[model samples]
Target: SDLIPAPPLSKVPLQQNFQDNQFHGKWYVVGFAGNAILREDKDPQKMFATIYELKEDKSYNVTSVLFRKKKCDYWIRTFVPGSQPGEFTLGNIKSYPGLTSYLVRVVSTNYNQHAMVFFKWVSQNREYFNITLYGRTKELTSELKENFIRFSKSLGLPENHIVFPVPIDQCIDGSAWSHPQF
Candidate 1:
């Protein structure tokens, strides 16, 4: 997709430097939008915090863990950069084993307070566009939530689509999202 400029199709902007995206560390899924595929679609607000570890090789290793009804499961995902800065191709992803064309974009963030990303991809010709708002703490101000909703709506996301993912206070070791086994 990096072969040329962005198409007329919908695509949010990304950080200027992928290397400085600072998408590492623990981030709570405060807000989310777009299509709902799995359990998170019904209640993203209940989703647990996920951890991302960015590498110097212009890549990253991440852990997305969830605790549901005595079930503690996680999805370990890895990706390598493509020709573009923010574009990444899924590598050995388990949750969505067939996932490809990974597009991770850090549209806005203050590092300490909150961060916003436009994460989108396609599989089997099914387009999936997702907007995620991250916060260092599960608690975020209403203003930030409103801002994310507004931004998401501007990107053609339905008003009802923007949602606050419920937080799970305890998920595994809580810090297990940081120490990914795979």
Candidate 2:
């Protein structure tokens, strides 16, 4: 009852207005649930945090500051088509040291609601990490929550790993109403 799966790929419709939906605003990491590569100082904070802004060219500018770092590191990637607006493939810039690319599957989406699954193929480990869930809004209505649970269940992600962040009224850009600790 506490957990749910992602909707199957077949259920997701192709996004004709992908460009419009993708380039709108900064996607802050409201909350997430998944396994991450944790470090000594980072372990306390779960070492998992990122924000993404989509550019006009279908590319994305990512600001990820994992492990409670003071500054955010930038990454550039392009998107490929997926089952729907919420799903796509993101490839890293050639300059990056890691793998060439990874899959970003969208589990669900509405006009304002979004949920996605991120995966990377770690060449060093030769394995795929579990799916991570992130949402666009801080609060979800009962109907939306039920949809999210169904989406998570479809992906086979464990129920225990699905955690939500505490509600904060402001944006991630150090806005006045954002969490004060940040």
Candidate 3:
């Protein structure tokens, strides 16, 4: 097949002793580099907040809030642990049809300040790759930004594809969890 395949899972490294409890917290999407999806969309991307809730069963309930099209959009997804420690698979197969599989890997994290994550998904025989640099706050450090660019470049991403989204005022709150009321 001529289509590009997802990165080799076995070769992708994970954070050592990745603490699920410590990882469960708020993160701001500071850096993003993806496949054609980002290229296809003409609208500029904006920074967003994500809350990760770790379950007893080693699954993660993720909630994300982003400002787009002049409104805030809230998204929730469940991620089930894979065979490894820092690996997870998207469990919402029914909600996202044609999304055959989605895999997430914790590349590296300090559990307090910064994190690097890789996302790979296959849909309709096409493979997609996305790398996200998460920060405890909306601020982005030069060190982390360099690391993010380096990591994305290693995955064959071009410089034009990478972006650092500016923070938005809307949906930046991490405690406003009153669903159907926000």
Candidate 4:
């Protein structure tokens, strides 16, 4: 069996002059594109929403709300700024110790209408990538959609593997999602 090679992470470019405050807000995850590992034809992952809160230290607090199997779940993570403004690395993790690398970058965005974020996950010898299309609202313009597809294709992701998920009414409100404090 032949395995498709993952795209070079270095080749991907980050957003120009990305601003932290402008990016801090709610975003509707309208699209997601990934390779075999990210989309193995298994039960498809549903659409989700995310909220980003920028910290004074230039780090970020991110909350992702996901709806699966008719239930809602949310994850809280801290993103530490990288060498660049538009780049970040996962700051804390207790699960998946084998995760060798986790990188995130803002490929493109206007900070008003839409944003495209790239994620790279590495484990052992396998590298998996995912592109998330974020929008200020649930409905994105065709221009943004075209850009998302083009970027996904540039990453060597198959067309069928790229998907624009259907939006669910649940989990749209930030107050609806909560996390327990220890």
Candidate 5:
């Protein structure tokens, strides 16, 4: 068969780690699939390339550079861990308004080669899905892409809905994008 529908939400699986701290490394959001206002629509080759750094706080410290139209400017986001092990939320918080929270989850990871993450945020009354395929390098194999699709399907993303953001060579920090460098 070429495709299958995702199970009910109660069946949406989570990565089995009480502390997302130990996944412990950098993961590039080289590609993704989604239909949301926050989609990586711009060329992310620094325009909006997302570079993730795992933190001991049990969340991801994302360094995203906005270099498409703007000059090499960047922003850092702290994704706070949610009540669930793999669940997290990013919010500037209620007392504040600029950095309000967004839902995040480490859907799954293979440790050596790839990882898939799910981002859920509500714009109105409905939730949107932003599934990412992280790899050791900017490029990933077709098999990895397919594998990621099924993995996302387990969490409710149709194959036709996935979007792959283009890759950037490196970042302004001058560090190369290598796989899981401890």
Candidate 6:
């Protein structure tokens, strides 16, 4: 239904050193919660997108097969540090013309875990697209996983909507992941 509750903001931690949040390397989408254009899809393969790197210059390169083919997509954006260490203002890449209206706010994070909220704003339509959990390693620590789920629930996303990305055999140690080469 369209009546889903927004995640509780209180449960989300506020980081103060947002610029140093270390987005320089590869980040696999371990699990996701929140809403998206493809939220209702039953296929687990279509549940996530990968962030190959967040370059020092503030541009980003991404790859995902969840919503599209397994091909790679490039996005360049200027990242303005948010109020905290984990939060940020993601400006749309000029190359991706239709994505400028969106802004990514990282509501909480620790050294090894992150919980981010993304809003796709078009004209007057502001849609909550997704809540993503990322870890430094391929598998998240049990405590971090629990915290992430709690954070998602606070955001009003249903437990069932939280789905994990299908594991790629080669990515076992997250070495196959890397930040933008540029």
In candidate 6, stretches whose alpha carbon ends up further than 4 angstroms from where it belongs are 1-12, 19-21, 37-42, 46-70, 73-78, 82-85, 92-101, 112-124, 169-182
Q: Write one digit per residue (lDDT tens) for candidate 2, span 31-73.
A: 4544342213322333234456666665455555432355444
Best by TM-score: 3
| Model 5 agreement with the true structure over 112-145: per-residue lDDT tens digits | 5677777766443444566777765667788888
lDDT of each: 0.69, 0.47, 0.82, 0.82, 0.61, 0.52
TM for every model, in the order presented, reads 0.76, 0.57, 0.86, 0.85, 0.68, 0.62
Q: Select the stronger candidate by lDDT from 2 and 5.
A: 5
lDDT, candidate 6, 129-152, per-residue tens: 567776555467667667667766
Global Cα RMSD, each model:
7.1, 6.4, 4.8, 5.7, 6.7, 6.4
lDDT: which is higher, 5 or 6? Answer: 5
Clash number by candidate, in order: 4, 13, 0, 0, 10, 14
| Regions more than 4 Å wrong, model 1 | 1-11, 18-21, 37-45, 92-100, 172-182
* lDDT (Cα) of model 5: 0.61
- Give Cα distance to truth, residue 41, candidate 1, Å: 11
Q: Write the per-residue lDDT of candidate 4 for residues 40-128, one digit (tens) a residue.
A: 34566567899999999989999998876668788888899987989998886446687877889998888998999998877766777
| Cα deviation of 80, candidate 4, in Å | 0.3
Give the TM-score (vs. native) of candidate 3: 0.86
Could you give candidate 1's per-residue lDDT for residues 34-138 as a string of tens digits?
A: 754223454344766678788777577878877776787787877677556766667654467566556666777777778887766767556677778888988
Candidate 1: what lDDT? Answer: 0.69
RMSD of 3: 4.8
